[PDB]
Amino acid sequence: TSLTITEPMEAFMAGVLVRYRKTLIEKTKYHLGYPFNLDLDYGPLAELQHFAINNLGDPFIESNYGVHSRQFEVGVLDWFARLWEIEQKEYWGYITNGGTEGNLHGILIGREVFPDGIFYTSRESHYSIFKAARMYRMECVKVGTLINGEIDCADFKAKLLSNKDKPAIINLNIGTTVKGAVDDIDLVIQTLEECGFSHDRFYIHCDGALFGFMMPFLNRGPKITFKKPIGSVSVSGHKFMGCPTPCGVQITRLEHINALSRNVEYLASRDATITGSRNGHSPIILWYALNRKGFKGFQKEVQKCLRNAHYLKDRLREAGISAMLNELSSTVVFERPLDEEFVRRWQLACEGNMAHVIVMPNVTIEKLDEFLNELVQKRANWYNDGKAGPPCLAPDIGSENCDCDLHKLKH
Amino acid sequence: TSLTITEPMEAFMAGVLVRYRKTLIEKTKYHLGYPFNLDLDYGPLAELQHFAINNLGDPFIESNYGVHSRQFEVGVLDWFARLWEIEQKEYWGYITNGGTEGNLHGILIGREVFPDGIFYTSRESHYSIFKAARMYRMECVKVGTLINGEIDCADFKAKLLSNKDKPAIINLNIGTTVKGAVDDIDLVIQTLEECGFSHDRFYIHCDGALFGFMMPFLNRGPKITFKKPIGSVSVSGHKFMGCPTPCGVQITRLEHINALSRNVEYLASRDATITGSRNGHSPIILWYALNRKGFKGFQKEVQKCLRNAHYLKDRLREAGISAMLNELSSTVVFERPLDEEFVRRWQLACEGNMAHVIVMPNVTIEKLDEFLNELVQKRANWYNDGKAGPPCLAPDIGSENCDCDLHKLKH
Ligand SMILES: [Zn+2]
Ligand SMILES: [Zn+2]
Ligand SMILES: [Zn+2]
Ligand SMILES: [Zn+2]
């Protein structure tokens, strides 16, 4: 709970670090709950930990602080711009400290385009989104959600129509935290158009912390492209790509950044970021990864993760455990384990009667089998004899996906 | 300007990293302008770059994500609480991604204590402060500054008195960016009291990005202590202590955090941070440093830096170069070099007619001599023959510190 700092040792401290490394190997082995790629292969870059790298200021305007990684950073941003179909001279962006910063930036951009804008996001938006709205003092209208976690564009439509006067700022979830739903970009855009909102009276941010990275590697789904009238897209680098430290990529339209960007004389750069000092090792790490693997290495990794999710779901239903997997998802929602020591061991994320597993590149079939074997074994003790019987997840995941004493019958 | 990412190499990429390491050694050698300690000695911790460490959530409430460094983080926060004289059960805080996040958090805390609060900060506050005020939609009253960069408590008094009705939220600069001034905490507090503001109608944040760390190691100055009615203090970890990546420490009063802190079920933790995912290598790095050096190692390092600043200033005045150093400062303000290739080589920060050198632990007498020898040599070419004569820095640093053709006479 605390490692106290005492006054002057190198055997004590190397003792601690040996012990600690041990626990991190254990934790890394059993981690299944959170969307972090734990297969980190950046051993050559670790030398660079000798430098105080700081990308302080604009990625595209070099500051007087010379210990930076802008060549890498700009490399990576260009790749992301290509990925989301925006040209060099149409886009601006930066490597962030994570999905939260991408969301704070994107929503702030939208506010500056439309200071009077009403803000809309689904009920299953990440907590960062509602935090942003409160930080920024924006009126937030929570939009309903279908069973699977997608924004409800009928409820969206309704809500739009009762604020016809004002501009709409929208956050769309490309892979919701709990259920792994993907908001229908195309349908949201259509709904705006047929409610009388033209491009120049709405701003959309796409929160793609995990799945915004993954979706472009599939042939399907509501493609993320600035050929459509979206404003900004963020992803998290420590989620799908994998990074020792949290990071992200935020990409917007250049015309949008002018309202945030101010000159700062003592930097000889501009400030258009949430942050000041910025992590300059992240850009190198992500550059390294993009180069080694390319679009075809990432595609493979994405496809294997969807397959491994499919597999886990199948085995759970087979075991008569309520479980759901959305079409565009590596997140397997399932009946929350009753044993909370079990939850803590596999580091499961839980909400109400749901838990979930996120099938990151590190998450192998071998590991899923270990997991299932343990789950099925312990589960036998939870709902048998005169005890309750499994919870009903039909309200959360649909009755088609529920295997309680009632809904299992209908399959 | 860009290192393009191409599709599949390990000789090309290790070629790039050899080249790049070279430039970072060069940059590290000549860096003088920014407040980053470049003497990083954390080579043993670099193994830990193999792990996706994430302190996601509250430092004091463990989340279900197990790959974290809370033992280290909490260790470090406790040390900082001791340092600023606040008890375990009176304080909350976290390790941030830098001084900007500390400021965003602190100012946001103050807003939640006083939603109607008028916000006050000096004209020489960091850009993060004015950014925060705009992000948060807070009315910001810029307070004047004495020549040396300290907040002007007469102008403060005046400004307070014309907003007697509303609470006061104040940012105080403990080491302003450009001039290295320290706002007079004690005098600000007195001014509030004699203007009719009792403790429970003002909130103070101390921005101590560089000097909040350094000041406690001196026997003098407006001591930073929660025994006085301050609300929150931030420092930057990559400034004085030194860290490969930007980080910081934000420490507030526990009673203050309740308004920001919300439970997040899927984490099994609380969200009271600006961020979500948080860097978990930083806490280890700062823990390592605090343990190896202790209060007595840091004191020594602080004292040497003040001495080396004193030295640089003296040699500049000797060379008839306008220069100033505040009493509680390692930042040497001086006539801005006319040669902007020279500015770029020593990575100097510049504002108007001022440049500055920040004497971080890495900045040795040997290095300062190299610098001065070059400066004096080139300067001989700038203001001689029929050309202008040096600029006057008296408006910026005081006529006592100016060595232009006019003010040098009066000394
Ligand atoms: Zn199937
Ligand atoms: Zn059911
Ligand atoms: Zn002297
Ligand atoms: Zn003068």
Residue numbers in the entry:
A (entry chain A), B (entry chain A): 62 to 69, 79 to 481
Publication excerpt:
Through optimization of crystallization conditions, we successfully determined the crystal structures of CsAlaDC, CsAlaDC-EA, and AtSerDC at resolutions of 2.50 Å, 2.60 Å, and 2.85 Å, respectively. However, the corresponding loop in CsAlaDC is disordered. Upon superimposing the active site residues of CsAlaDC apo and CsAlaDC-EA complex, it was observed that the hydroxyl group of Tyr336* in the CsAlaDC-EA complex exhibits a substantial 60 degree deviation along the Cα-Cβ bond. The superposition of amino acid residues in the substrate binding pocket of CsAlaDC and AtSerDC revealed that all residues are identical, except for the substitution of Tyr at position 111 in AtSerDC with Phe at position 106 in CsAlaDC. The results revealed that AtSerDCY111F acquired alanine decarboxylase activity, whereas CsAlaDCF106Y completely lost its alanine decarboxylase activity. Among these mutants, only AtSerDCY111I exhibited a marginal level of alanine decarboxylase activity. These findings indicate the essential role of Phe106 in the selective binding of alanine for CsAlaDC. To identify the amino acids repressing the enzymatic activity of CsAlaDC during evolution from SerDC, we analyzed the crystal structures and the amino acids at the dimer interface between CsAlaDC, and AtSerDC. This analysis revealed that the amino acids at the dimer interface at positions 66, 97, 110, 114, 116, 117, 122, 315, and 345 are different in CsAlaDC and SerDCs. The results demonstrated that CsAlaDCL110F and CsAlaDCP114A exhibited significantly enhanced enzyme activity compared to the wild-type CsAlaDC, with a 2.1-fold and 1.59-fold increase, respectively. Our findings indicate that, following the excision of the zinc finger structure, CsAlaDC became insoluble, while AtSerDC displayed a similar trait to a certain extent.
Ethylamine (EA), the precursor of theanine biosynthesis, is synthesized from alanine decarboxylation by alanine decarboxylase (AlaDC) in tea plants. In this study, we solved the X-ray crystal structures of AlaDC from Camellia sinensis (CsAlaDC) and SerDC from Arabidopsis thaliana (AtSerDC). CsAlaDC and AtSerDC are Group II PLP-dependent amino acid decarboxylases, which exhibit numerous structural features common to other amino acid decarboxylases. The overall structure of CsAlaDC or AtSerDC is homodimeric with two subunits exhibiting an asymmetrical arrangement.
